[PDB]
Design a protein around this ligand. Structure first.
Ligand SMILES: [Cl-]
Ligand SMILES: [Cl-]
Ligand SMILES: [Cl-]
Lengths: 294, 296, 309, 298, 294, 306
């Protein structure tokens, strides 16, 4: 009977006492996943108006739309950042929970992010053009903006990256993993990535925290820019110089691996050492076995 | 008091819209809506697989009402979306800007394409019935047709692809790629709407599969996760492979090139990377890998 | 018969008279339901609901990780209300969903048409079993969270892991699905794991057996088969397949304690055992056993280098 | 502060305890009563069927209306069945002092479905009646713009539509639901019609706020009422409310009381008239010209 | 369930038989819900900070207003056009025909712009109504309480919007608005009524004001007041002059009935003839009978 | 009805260029008429938050009759506990805004746990008296059953009798009034007034076993005092003298019935225990206990229709 339910409830609540690591019970709200996703939506509406939720934006009403989003983002970002800072401070110092202070610091950070939205749009315009240049078959800039997952993942990454530079805990990774969830493109928020970046297809792409990518680089599906199996904090991920292309399913590992300007890394190539500028690296023609099914 | 700087930030953002006009669409001419397109896709799937989607109370005595309503609504919504796609593509091809009255241009043409799509739904069900059976045939361990329809991501991605493909054949801009990229997002399966794919197609697992615009796949084919049917790095014009009937391609294989033909009943083994044709009834496998073993 | 632009009829609006054809389209669609009955479930026998299963999953996660999901205002003084309400609701919803799954499977197993046992009572028993083991699942998942922290040195905190590491999410859903699998619930286990698959690109069959302190880092492209058995303290990376040979019955590998399998490795076969503390390097493809304490890596690849022109 | 939040568990317990002490204003147990929201929803769907094009959907035409109606009928069948069954079961248990542990062995679902089918079957007839009501509003209001304006927003028509639905449920012995319907309409219009009232066709309430019509009241055809009219029972007293014959008009703030009061065919009851006795056909009843006092202001 | 298709068919049949109570065709009438939403938006413009949003300040209110004005332009145009088209067709016995029609659209837009243009003037009039409520209710807590919840103010606000639409010859919509307010307050004001500034209804339940009624400035009414037409009859409703107070349950009837400047109509007074300026009209004390109970 | 020329052209999109200017004139009007806005950084209480609070309180008072139908003794603690927790937060916030705004207004102060703590204390007081309120409301329910012999059941009364809804809201509002909460009490009674046409000032004092039958058009003034076992009908006014805080509305003693459309006026008017005020009676002075007041039989005119 339902008479068992109160007891099951009580055992679960008891388990909150026993295993305290997987709950946050108390008077100190962490940041909200949903609030961070909503922030992300609003930021994207500012960056690509006409391509998101509203389709009735024109020069005569866009100020009202942006103005309202900026006002709301100021409040929401401040709140979420403040909770991230408070929680991280408490955790670092082992302090328990029992417009000033962290709030003011959060607001300062929030305003910095909002102030760089014009600059971000400049950067993102070059990424859009990189997608157009990088995919000859592409219909239009509009198609790219609507639905190229590489552009979406990069957009989120660039927002998360700015917050990373501002020492915001939690929220950068929450943003990148949201994009990762939608696109299968996994970019650490600490990665440094220059303008005119394009990921085509993208599923399975992984880019590590200390990875440094210059301008005009293109990656394909399944590319890993990662750390070596064996032994921007301590550099453990590769540097990719300008105008590099890395084809599908390549792997590039190591904090000292530099892929030089204008290099091409062929499909399925696995590298743990530097490549000179102007080099095409490809796999040896595979040795395949053939048999008839009989 | 610091909220007083927000109006200035707002003005700088609006200014950036003048300076970088390539990444916005401001004006009196709505583009197609991602959300409306998604909703259309939901309604189409309701028609294709009733009893497996949102409603669970459908039977032969009420199904006409469900379908009839969806068909009527889809007529209106697809017409609207497709017309906006056609108008946008017209304006872009001609470099013309947005008019000062509301424009019904292309509405009749959009309606004609919409009706063609709705007319094909019975045929699409026939094809999808074979795909469903192909999943059951292709995965011994499958619990039932029901399980497949409910949650096999391959079937979902292919369903969206087949819808998008019909729109592609009708020269609808934007909407086909919007559909396949939606499916791509949900399944990790990346099928270009331009691909040609015969009946009884099955993708098992599916994450990381990529199939290019020009790829041609015949009947009774099965692929696994991480398969690429793609273009050569270097050496409507055909740049993607042709796969003949009854071929199976195992996990993480790569088949590249517009002149690569994989012959009837061939098997492409796991991790095989090919840029040349394979005759019928050939099993192609990698050379046993050379591995290094050491004590830790 | 001339025009001011390329396609003829560009000026014409929607012809509303053409709406008269829609009833016929509708009738042909309904006819196709008669002709191809395999891809619909029309009748008086609701199958389980995808949406209901998703909602159940949300509520289970709220119980497992309170404070990290939808509510942020939970404390020891109000958590009883939160849990008690969810347990009550889950009891009803899981019973309903499981009962429909059992009924449908029974009918399908036999010939029985929709026009036999007490499936509701059996469903409720299975539901109660699941709810009873939530404290135990919390214990397991606490170790998984710690394994993510240990397995990723660059990890910010337990908090960041719980909030957004996709491996933890996929493993949480899998562990719930697995218990339902062990209770012989049809449909629902795979519905759960495919949901997580869709969200993370991590594909765990609900039949897989996986010990505590399991960690998937990155994870996109991971596939684990039905009969795979993974021990304690195992760590996997993106693109790893633990699958079946191309060329009930065990068809998937066994991975022993403390094994690490790096990105894009493939391990195949029912008889393949990867031994305690082994390391399978990136892109390693194996269909045979490896002893304890063995590090397996690919041979340095043979690469061609030439000038880009 | 947050320390005071520690009192909330205790306040919660005081409330739960009070459910044990005062059981009459709660219904806790495993026997859901009917849902106000579900009844309101049913009413919305019924109105969609009766007045398509004037309610929620604006894209209905002869080519799609079968799908709309077919779907609503199907939904209503399930929801009305559920709501009626819950009402019947509760009323059974209450009348017999049974209680919710003790299983009901009676098939209220089948009976609820039968009552539901009866209501659905008479919707065509109800449309016939309501068509006459709409015309009566047009004929009864000189200033009326169109039938469309009337259908859209005349509160008299809305209250009467709900009443007519509630009345058929009343005649089918459905507990709770008929009064839930009429009270919803009362809430929206100020027009308070008991579901038991008997009202003929071509009925019109103009303005309507403050209208009260009692359970046993009987109104013929072509009757018109204004705001504030009471057709009620005697204060100092089975039929306890008046009978109004055809073609009667009753002006604002009139009061007509008593089970034996018959207002005769084509009578006119003037503004503010208060009556507790019958009136013959073709009689105009008015108040005596009031004696008013006039004084200069300061 | 086997009975249901037949019931469905008989209902559809009855649509053919009784065609006056449906609007089936290709010609959307106006939408009640769209009209209500338009009314919500207009109310937000008229009384910002007292409606749905509570975070409005001088720095963001332009964005809020600007956005609503932009949207209201589109939605009012659409609703008014549908009203004009339907009413014209109906008046002239024209049927729907099977073409999507821009008919009356430009005229609807014109009327819509005129309405939006007079919103500043409406605010000026309503500021006088709010003061009248404060003046007319000496027990009133604050202007805020009045604005928040005095039902007289809400009914008058709706009526004033409806009345401007009535003056613009917009069919259907004005009555839709006043009946909506009627439904929420028990106050029934025909949109055709003429009402001057500083108007106040206190309590209000049961107030009826007729189409041809004319009310001057500084007038106050109470619950249950009827300003109506004669039972035994183009002006059919009374004229109320400046500074008149009409107390609870009074009834004032007739097109030729003029209540003179500064008159007072006492509770329960029933009048069908003019009253001179500066006159206080009261009922004769009732003849009451008293008896001891038992 | 001349249709002006140009009427049938499509919307002219360049006319939207005028909308910014219209917007500016509207904003200007906020500067010119500042009494009818509340622009700034100090939000007032929200109508919708107050309504939601009211819904939650009603769920606590009448569980099984409102939004949830699956409540039983095994789960009701969870339901109530959660509502109380949420109410504590929301009532605290709303009350604090009421108190802050009222203080600023009463003094000159402009906008650039003090009130919060005071708000919380009042919120706790309200929540603590909910069991007592349920006792009182149970008596009101029973008074409706006793006072309307045709009533089907307590259930029906709870489900849909408007008098009981109006009175429920009034009793909640009245407790907030007694705690000197500005704004919110009148917001609550006006909401009830809107749904029922029953208009009760939050300051009214009303004893147990109170029933209003039908109710539309009832008005009860701020200083009115109503004892126990009182019944009112539709259209009853308990109001102030037109030509006369400090008592200006009547006192109604126990067991009084007032029938439809009666008017009782004046702060010194006391209607004695067990009196009956007949339909349409108008009274502006006291009547002793056990007095039955009726109007003289009306003098009516009858004529033949012509
Ligand atoms: Cl592709
Ligand atoms: Cl009516
Ligand atoms: Cl009106």
């Amino acid at each position: 009977l339902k008479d068992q339910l109160p007891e099951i409830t009580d055992r679960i609540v008891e388990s909150y006492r026993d295993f305290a690591t997987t709950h946050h019970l108390g008077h100190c709200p962490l940041p909200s996943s949903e609030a961070v996703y909503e922030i992300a939506q609003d930021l994207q509406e500012i960056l690509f108006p006409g391509y998101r939720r509203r389709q009735n934006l024109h020069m005569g009403n866009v100020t009202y739309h942006v103005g309202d989003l900026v006002d709301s983002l100021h409040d929401r970002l401040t709140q979420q950042i403040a909770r991230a800072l408070r929680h991280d401070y408490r955790r670092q110092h082992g302090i328990s929970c029992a417009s000033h202070d962290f709030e003011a610091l959060a607001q300062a950070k929030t305003i910095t992010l909002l102030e760089l939205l014009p600059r971000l749009r400049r950067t993102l315009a070059l990424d859009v053009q990189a997608a157009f240049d990088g995919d000859p078959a592409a219909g239009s800039l509009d198609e790219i903006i609507f639905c190229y997952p590489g552009l979406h993942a990069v957009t989120i990454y660039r927002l998360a990256h700015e917050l990373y530079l501002l020492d915001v805990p939690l929220i950068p990774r929450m943003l990148t993993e949201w994009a990762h969830s939608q696109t299968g493109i996994d970019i650490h928020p600490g990665a440094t990535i220059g303008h005119s970046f394009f990921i085509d297809h993208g599923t399975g792409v992984v880019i590590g925290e200390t990875c440094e990518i210059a301008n005009h680089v293109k990656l394909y599906q399944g590319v890993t820019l990662g750390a070596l199996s064996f032994p921007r904090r301590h550099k453990r991920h590769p540097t990719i110089e300008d105008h590099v292309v890395i084809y599908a399913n390549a792997t590039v590992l190591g904090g000292e691996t530099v892929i030089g300007s204008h290099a091409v890394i062929g499909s399925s190539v696995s590298l743990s050492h530097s490549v000179p500028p102007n080099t095409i690296v490809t796999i040896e023609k595979p040795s395949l076995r053939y048999r008839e099914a009989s």
